[PDB]
Amino acid sequence: KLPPGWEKAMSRSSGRVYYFNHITNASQWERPSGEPARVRCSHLLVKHSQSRRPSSWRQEKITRTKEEALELINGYIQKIKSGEEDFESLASQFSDCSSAKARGDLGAFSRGQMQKPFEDASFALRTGEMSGPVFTDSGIHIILRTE
């Protein structure tokens, strides 16, 4: 029926059908369109107090809760989707990964290199697509597939 990971859902607020991907946590109104050895992705990471290393270039000791990190992630996604902010700008300013200095770009990678939830989401995105919140031991990620 639908591409890998996608399913139909019903909006509670509006009643209209939408589509949700349980691998990437993406959601959208439009029906999803249409695997490579390698993909190229950028990401924006928000760490929290239970991250494997609760420290980053932005903060020596990260104290925000997981719930607070998810709220920050949700807000970044909202501004990216409305066009108020670009993914690259938010990643450079607010990502708790040192890849912030390269606008979030991780370069190209294969399966078996990244943490599993990150890898699975990266390879389930189509080129140009963006994930919802993706949870790893490092924190919560927004992933943008660029190639």
Ligand SMILES: OCc1cccc2[nH]ccc12
């Ligand atoms: O690695 C330190 C550093 C140098 C230059 C730009 C940066 N952005 C985030 C960390 C960072």
Ligand SMILES: OCc1cccc2[nH]ccc12
């Ligand atoms: O493995 C997931 C991942 C990929 C690339 C950069 C990252 N930084 C923190 C986690 C992380």
